[PDB]
Design an enzyme around this catalytic site. Structure first.
Site, PDB file in Angstrom:
ATOM      1  N   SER A 212      -0.137 -11.287   5.502  1.00 29.14           N
ATOM      2  CA  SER A 212      -0.185 -12.159   6.687  1.00 29.14           C
ATOM      3  C   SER A 212      -1.332 -13.157   6.757  1.00 29.14           C
ATOM      4  CB  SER A 212      -0.133 -11.356   8.009  1.00 29.14           C
ATOM      5  OG  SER A 212       1.107 -10.678   8.172  1.00 29.14           O
TER       6      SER A 212
ATOM      7  N   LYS B 177      -0.442 -16.886   7.172  1.00 29.11           N
ATOM      8  CA  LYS B 177      -0.235 -17.546   8.459  1.00 29.11           C
ATOM      9  C   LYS B 177      -1.353 -18.522   8.758  1.00 29.11           C
ATOM     10  CE  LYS B 177       2.743 -14.091  10.642  1.00 29.11           C
ATOM     11  NZ  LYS B 177       2.782 -12.786   9.868  1.00 29.11           N
TER      12      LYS B 177
ATOM     13  N   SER C 107       0.494 -11.416  14.771  1.00 30.17           N
ATOM     14  CA  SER C 107       0.961 -11.777  13.446  1.00 30.17           C
ATOM     15  C   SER C 107       2.500 -11.777  13.413  1.00 30.17           C
ATOM     16  CB  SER C 107       0.384 -10.803  12.418  1.00 30.17           C
ATOM     17  OG  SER C 107       0.628 -11.288  11.126  1.00 30.17           O
TER      18      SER C 107
HETATM   19  C1  LIG Z   1       1.082  -9.330   7.855  1.00 33.79           C
HETATM   20  O1  LIG Z   1       0.491  -8.684   7.013  1.00 33.79           O
HETATM   21  C2  LIG Z   1       1.977  -8.554   8.725  1.00 33.79           C
HETATM   22  C3  LIG Z   1       2.937  -9.062   9.477  1.00 33.79           C
HETATM   23  N1  LIG Z   1       3.439  -8.740  10.791  1.00 33.79           N
HETATM   24  C4  LIG Z   1       3.648  -7.260  10.737  1.00 33.79           C
HETATM   25  C5  LIG Z   1       4.628  -6.743   9.700  1.00 33.79           C
HETATM   26  O2  LIG Z   1       5.036  -5.559   9.836  1.00 33.79           O
HETATM   27  O3  LIG Z   1       4.998  -7.460   8.733  1.00 33.79           O
HETATM   28  C6  LIG Z   1       2.302  -6.586  10.441  1.00 33.79           C
HETATM   29  C7  LIG Z   1       2.393  -5.088  10.678  1.00 33.79           C
HETATM   30  C8  LIG Z   1       1.186  -7.096  11.351  1.00 33.79           C
HETATM   31  S1  LIG Z   1       1.894  -6.881   8.726  1.00 33.79           S
END
Ligand SMILES: *C(=O)C1=CN[C@@H](C(=O)O)C(C)(C)S1
Ligand SMILES: [Co+2]
Ligand SMILES: [Co+2]
Ligand SMILES: [Co+2]
Ligand SMILES: [Co+2]
EC number: 3.4.16.4
Length: 466
Positions: free
Chosen positions: A49, A52, A298
């Site tokens: 993430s 982003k 996120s």
């Molecule tokens: C980034 O690492 C992430 C993205 N949104 C969630 C997902 O499950 O993909 C998170 C758990 C925050 S991990």
């Protein structure tokens, strides 16, 4: 004081949890441009993430902080004496915060335009983006889960966090040996239910599983919920986010005294439609405000929606291929050297993405120069802040340390991937850092990242609370 900082991070980086892992760690003074620490800053790594950061910065560049997203309702002509229309289109143009409440308000607008009867069919038009629902290399086994929702220009956002393309699934126990009660949420009447869950004895083991098996629009519930367990909710995806928007809008219309006689499905406004009559519209908040739920929690759907939106702005193409290219151009035009960047998506979900620590810190520095710097840095999770809309994914990390309320940083996490990148402001220096870890085979290396973030906070001039 530089050498002591260097010796400490070195020692933090010795941790057993980092055995056989590759870690990019770069620290810089954003004021003096001083290099404070650099280990493997040119090494290409999966960012999860942390991707982003690049997406948000690009979205601010292309669309602007003031950008908003629209949704329309069209008929071929306005309602007449008899308040009749034939077919009706609900048209999404990339709003990632469109709620069931907003569908109700538009439903009330349709009725206030003097429509009493939709004589034809209701169509959900998401043709503003392409119909590619998922990135190539995303895993099919991850598909039931919120972070993996299908991407559409027309999608309903659940909750104050605006989680797109999902329904909230509830399971409530009964007496021992009787089936659990299951609720599908928004997708009641849209998705299928396959409920095999039973109520177990009080004090027994919770083994409930909520699935949506691959390639189906069925929510499958198995296992056992103990008679004394608390009622459960889980967000699960649906096939075709827009056809759910369609179904939910059908519900809102009827609630606002408009009868739909025909069917609900996907379809785009015909084009032999000479001058469509817009009977309702909605306008999201501006991007600067949308950045908060998106970056704090996120939100993956948001990122991909923002990429296809970039594509539309730069090229008229609501498409990963066009948007991703526009993400690079925008980063380039921002002074970022993108040589080490590989973009396969906006969210970081994809294992096709690559960054380097230097590229990240490069971005972190180049953003502060831009007009939208304050709104960007506001969207970042704040370490140890218990308000979810402040602390985000950092809410329960670094509490009661010098980093609490100071470190502003984006997280990222996958199997064998962990990242923490952002800012540490202080009287002793305004710091930008990136910590990217790949290939660790044990616990998530969060104690290492925290340990560095806290040490940086101490360097920037903060004190542990007592
Ligand atoms: C980034 O690492 C992430 C993205 N949104 C969630 C997902 O499950 O993909 C998170 C758990 C925050 S991990
Ligand atoms: Co704009
Ligand atoms: Co909820
Ligand atoms: Co329903
Ligand atoms: Co402080």
């Amino acid at each position: 004081r530089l050498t002591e900082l260097r010796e400490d991070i070195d020692a933090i980086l010795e941790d057993p949890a980092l055995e056989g892992a590759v870690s990019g760690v770069v620290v810089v003074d954003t004021a003096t441009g001083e290099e404070l620490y650099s280990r493997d800053g040119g090494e290409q790594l999966l960012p999860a993430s942390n991707m982003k950061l690049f997406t948000a910065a690009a979205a601010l560049e292309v669309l602007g902080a003031d950008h908003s997203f629209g949704t329309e309702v069209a008929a071929e002509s306005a309602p007449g004496r008899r308040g009749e229309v034939q077919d009706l289109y609900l048209v999404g143009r990339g709003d990632p915060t469109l709620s069931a409440e907003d569908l109700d308000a538009m439903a009330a607008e349709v009725a206030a335009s003097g429509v009493r009867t939709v004589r034809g069919d209701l169509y959900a038009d998401d043709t503003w983006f392409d119909s590619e629902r998922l990135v190539d290399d995303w895993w099919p086994e991850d598909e039931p889960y919120a972070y993996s929702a299908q991407i559409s220009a027309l999608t309903v956002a659940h909750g104050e966090r605006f989680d797109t393309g999902v329904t909230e699934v509830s399971v409530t126990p009964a007496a021992e040996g009787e089936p659990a009660d299951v609720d599908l949420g928004a997708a009641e009447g849209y998705a299928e239910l396959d409920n095999r869950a039973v109520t177990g004895a009080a004090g027994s083991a919770n083994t409930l599983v909520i699935d949506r098996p691959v390639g189906t629009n069925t929510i499958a519930v198995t296992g056992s919920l103990p008679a004394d367990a608390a009622p459960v909710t889980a967000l699960r995806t649906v096939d075709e986010p827009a056809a759910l928007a369609g179904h939910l809008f059908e519900e809102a219309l009827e609630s606002n005294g408009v009868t739909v006689k025909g069917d609900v499905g996907l379809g785009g406004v015909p084009a032999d439609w000479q001058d469509a009559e817009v009977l309702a519209d909605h306008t999201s908040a501006e991007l600067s405000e949308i950045l908060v739920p998106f970056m704090k929690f996120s939100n993956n759907g948001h990122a991909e929606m923002l990429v296809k939106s970039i594509g539309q702005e730069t090229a008229g193409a609501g498409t990963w291929d066009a948007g991703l290219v526009g993400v690079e151009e925008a980063l380039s035009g921002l002074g970022v050297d993108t040589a080490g960047l590989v973009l396969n998506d906006g969210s970081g979900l994809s294992r096709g993405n690559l960054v380097t620590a230097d590229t990240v810190v490069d971005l972190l520095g180049q953003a502060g120069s831009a007009p939208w710097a304050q709104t960007w840095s506001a969207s970042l999770p704040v370490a140890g802040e218990s308000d979810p809309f402040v602390g985000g994914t950092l809410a329960n990390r670094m509490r009661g340390t010098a980093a609490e309320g100071v470190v502003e940083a984006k997280t990222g996490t996958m199997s064998g991937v962990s990242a923490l990148s952002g800012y540490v402001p202080g009287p002793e220096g305004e710091l930008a850092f990136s910590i990217v870890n790949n290939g660790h085979s044990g616990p998530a290396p969060l104690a290492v990242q925290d340990a560095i973030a806290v040490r940086l906070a101490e360097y920037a001039g903060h004190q542990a609370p007592e």
